[PDB]
Symmetry: D2
Subunit: 285 residues, 4 copies
Amino acid sequence: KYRFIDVQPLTGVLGAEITGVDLREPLDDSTWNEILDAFHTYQVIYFPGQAITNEQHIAFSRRFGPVDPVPILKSIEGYPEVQMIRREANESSRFIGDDWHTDSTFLDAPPAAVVMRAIEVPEYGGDTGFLSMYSAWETLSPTMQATIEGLNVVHSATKVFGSLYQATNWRFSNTSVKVMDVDAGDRETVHPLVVTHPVTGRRALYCNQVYCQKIQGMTDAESKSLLQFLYEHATKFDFTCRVRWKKDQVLVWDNLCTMHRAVPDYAGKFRYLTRTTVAGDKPSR
Amino acid sequence: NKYRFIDVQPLTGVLGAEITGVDLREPLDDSTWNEILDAFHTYQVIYFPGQAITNEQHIAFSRRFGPVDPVPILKSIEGYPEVQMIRREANESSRFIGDDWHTDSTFLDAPPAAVVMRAIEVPEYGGDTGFLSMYSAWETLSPTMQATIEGLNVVHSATKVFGSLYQATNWRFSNTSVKVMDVDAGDRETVHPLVVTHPVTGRRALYCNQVYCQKIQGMTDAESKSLLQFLYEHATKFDFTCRVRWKKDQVLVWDNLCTMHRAVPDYAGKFRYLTRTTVAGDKPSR
Amino acid sequence: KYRFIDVQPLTGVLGAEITGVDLREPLDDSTWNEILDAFHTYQVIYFPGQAITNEQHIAFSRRFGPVDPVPILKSIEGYPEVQMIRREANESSRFIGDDWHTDSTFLDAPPAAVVMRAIEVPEYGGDTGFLSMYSAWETLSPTMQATIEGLNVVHSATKVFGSLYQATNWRFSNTSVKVMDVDAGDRETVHPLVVTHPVTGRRALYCNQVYCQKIQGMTDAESKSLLQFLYEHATKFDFTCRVRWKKDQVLVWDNLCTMHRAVPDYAGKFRYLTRTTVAGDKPSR
Amino acid sequence: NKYRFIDVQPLTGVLGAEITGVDLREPLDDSTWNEILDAFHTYQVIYFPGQAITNEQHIAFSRRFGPVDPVPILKSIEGYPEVQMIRREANESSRFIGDDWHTDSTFLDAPPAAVVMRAIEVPEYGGDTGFLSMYSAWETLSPTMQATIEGLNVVHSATKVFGSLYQATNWRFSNTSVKVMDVDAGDRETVHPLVVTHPVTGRRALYCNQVYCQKIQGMTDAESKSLLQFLYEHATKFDFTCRVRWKKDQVLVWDNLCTMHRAVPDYAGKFRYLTRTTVAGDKPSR
Ligand SMILES: C[C@@H](Oc1ccc(Oc2cnc3cc(Cl)ccc3n2)cc1)C(=O)O
Ligand SMILES: C[C@@H](Oc1ccc(Oc2cnc3cc(Cl)ccc3n2)cc1)C(=O)O
Ligand SMILES: C[C@@H](Oc1ccc(Oc2cnc3cc(Cl)ccc3n2)cc1)C(=O)O
Ligand SMILES: C[C@@H](Oc1ccc(Oc2cnc3cc(Cl)ccc3n2)cc1)C(=O)O
Ligand SMILES: O=C(O)CCC(=O)C(=O)O
Ligand SMILES: O=C(O)CCC(=O)C(=O)O
Ligand SMILES: O=C(O)CCC(=O)C(=O)O
Ligand SMILES: O=C(O)CCC(=O)C(=O)O
Ligand SMILES: [Cl-]
Ligand SMILES: [Cl-]
Ligand SMILES: [Co+2]
Ligand SMILES: [Co+2]
Ligand SMILES: [Co+2]
Ligand SMILES: [Co+2]
């Protein structure tokens, strides 16, 4: 069915490799329409072998929507919108993003999408996992769905760069991570536990252990119990795929309907990807 | 306190009350009965020490609470089909009856409303019964959690007690107090709401128990297990419980809709014998 | 079998009422020997109807061992060793001791025992629960016992009056609780997970959720998992008893082989008991 | 890297490797075989894309790893009792074979040492197999936790797969690939250590799986459940896993002692067919 690009789905759940296109060149309307369709169908799409410039990265990201950096990451000099996920070979700090999450959900309007490009990565190690929150939602019984669909969740960055972060002893390195204001870390926002994607109209479960503090209105014990069940459910191996990186692979993921995590199995090896983030609207039900 | 015809001594700040100043061998005037019924509705489990009543007076007093109807599983005393036994011979090595939190016979389309239990001969110590309030278990859920669960129903059956799950496992009750039952009666399912309204007080109570509840209707096995596990942990917190110690001729009534109870098995090697008459109820409803 | 006192066990597991003795008077050797035997047998013993003076309380406690206040509680004026568990009718703060624990196990040598006396208590509400850690230990399989008997646990007061306490929003009232130094709150000690009682020689499980931070040498996830199973096991209703208070009831509990908790079911009612604490040796295996 | 006769491309930093530069239709010289065996021991699961071998060459290549012996439950291809099928017709609505973390046939006194699996016809996408390293699951337990558990043994049986627990439940495998089995063979127990030493590498591996492990020997049901649940959660973290995608004529070998695997059921409605020969092992030991 695709005529302007070649798409090879990665699993029966999510993920697709796209080839037959050169992202260094402008895309005609037909080629862009297929790309966007593949992005909305497969949720995480990746293009091996795209030796693009940083400006081309920026422009390509702009096709998905307004570009706008996430609060915590350092950017390359000359490009505030091009942020780094960079780990030096000798680092001993915590690996960025090494549990399931989606990005910056403590924001009133988290990103819609992220476009990541491998600069220099290990021959093996440092895969990124993804999973579908559409599948997590769809595999809940209708009874379970009706039960939880009216709930909201309180999100904040407290464990990442607020008071809880300051409490613990593990730190990120300053290679890619900025020093942040503690109160900014502890500012709370509220999102729906079940969101409707604004383009596809499909529903997705929307919670993550990194930023979700509690179910709004619940006791700590009620909220901890529901959220724990939902995390176990959503992170079943069945709902995941695994993306392996090579130099100049460019990947886009939908930040509303997927979760992702870094795999820290390359200790002692240099790894560097850049990324631009695409702004989103307020998550809504 | 407000009581003028009976003396009531509440047992904890959550449920339970001792009632004295009354002789259950004699008939009760309307004034004394109304206060007893009121104390039953206010305290959920009430008990009357020192009541040396006959089996017939036990039956008659039970009847004041509602029609009397034995539960399926228990043997009864000779000459009194309505008076059933909770009896454990000293030597027994079988499972102790009722030794986890439950309420009685909820596999029935219409479980009992109440039970009236009377001590015949019990150990100097050991063999207390614990009780907890399902009004309190419900009221301490957040308004959010209440709204979340109030439309759910739960499938109950006796499969673990005298159905296929019972037949599959190794432990048994002795035949001292427990009849042989049909396996299909054991496996027969009924559905009740997760949250019920008491037909007299109008108050709401959480309604689930691990002995007879199989699953939340319409949910997957893992969803149901996970929610019911949380509710069991919530309702069985020590703060919601009271503990009743038995003495010969103590007579006790519990509300079988808004409480749970469990036997404490801490008297192995000692004889224990209580009788009970069960008072019938209506379909639990929302 | 008791000839100098009358003892009435409370449950088949632990607990005993003692009568037939006047604690306002000196005890002969025979009466004291029976008291101590009952204390070692039943683990928590209580004497209704003992209108004693504070000095008599102190002296009676001294028969069990050296007396020595616990760090957190305020004492009555004129008697540093007589501490208060006092809640005013109008209080809205956290109830002292409202989860299962044993006292001050963050100390290198926690108390051996505590002697508590009711001054003024509600007609109903404010029971104290107790449970036996001998029974908790004895109902573990031999295989489970051999598995865990070599483990140690790190204890500290951090959740009660150290950094974790400072983090949260709930506070105890200053009615009975002193302001404490944070570092004193966070000082760690190490005890055996399975201790041998120094008088009876019987073994007891020794862990509590209030002061135990983690199994020494374990990861956070391993330790949280074992300790959770042990707490669920030890706090089964089967292992508990419940003590109801009346004015001038004097009770002694063994602080090594039991746990206890306050029951907060008297909101809006005044409740006041005093207590002296009896010093112990370093818990050992 | 150190390899001079084969090209090996590791799959993740934990386990798994692709091997190219070799034609399994031809015999392997000692030098090429030694490197393959070494890569098997180093990477635990290895796979060879593009190997259009006959069933006989499949059998012969398997044999290089150890004596070949079919597992009890799977049907075999006509004319090759040692070559068993993992085959799912497009229309099937039965349970997917192997769809949770396990290692093969651990109810046996001596489970297989390895399996060699070959894709005949598989979906364009969907039907990957996941693998994880039980060396890594063991090595990431603290020294304290290791000392704690290293003396324990676990009781295994096939009761959930083709024993009484299977017969009691509702789901079934189809008869496409699965034989009817004797219920008593299903319920027969064996005991293995919780922590095993690999008989060639000498390295230690955690050894438990939820499909066949019933309980820690000597423990109570609640103790065993609670410890095994923790170990399952620990060993199945995403960080310890790799995922293999299948293509026609890919041939893959896994170590059945130091890994676990699971089928991913994400291809309903599509035909999938792999064959496999199982290589026999010795009693797992400490
Ligand atoms: C860029 C990105 O920022 C991060 C940074 C790190 C991150 O990964 C984790 C994983 N586990 C964590 C666990 C704890 Cl207890 C605390 C913090 C944790 N952080 C997730 C998102 C974002 O969101 O845009
Ligand atoms: C009279 C009464 O009958 C019983 C009998 C026993 C009973 O107690 C338990 C407790 N835990 C159990 C656990 C399992 Cl796996 C099986 C059976 C169990 N039975 C609860 C009710 C009733 O309801 O009228
Ligand atoms: C006198 C006594 O001091 C206390 C004071 C309070 C206490 O009770 C609790 C119960 N649950 C708690 C829960 C949390 Cl998260 C924190 C603190 C908690 N404290 C236990 C012991 C002692 O030990 O001698
Ligand atoms: C060939 C292989 O055979 C099987 C077949 C199926 C299998 O997969 C599962 C997964 N989860 C299961 C869960 C339950 Cl409750 C029951 C049976 C289950 N079976 C695991 C091994 C073997 O070992 O040789
Ligand atoms: O390094 C990775 O694979 C992903 C890190 C991540 O979570 C992120 O960039 O937001
Ligand atoms: O023996 C007891 O204390 C209670 C037994 C019980 O559960 C019952 O009679 O239903
Ligand atoms: O108030 C109570 O019943 C007990 C409080 C307590 O834990 C203590 O005094 O140590
Ligand atoms: O189908 C698969 O991917 C693996 C099935 C499996 O578990 C097995 O063959 O033992
Ligand atoms: Cl009647
Ligand atoms: Cl052979
Ligand atoms: Co991220
Ligand atoms: Co009962
Ligand atoms: Co205390
Ligand atoms: Co298998």
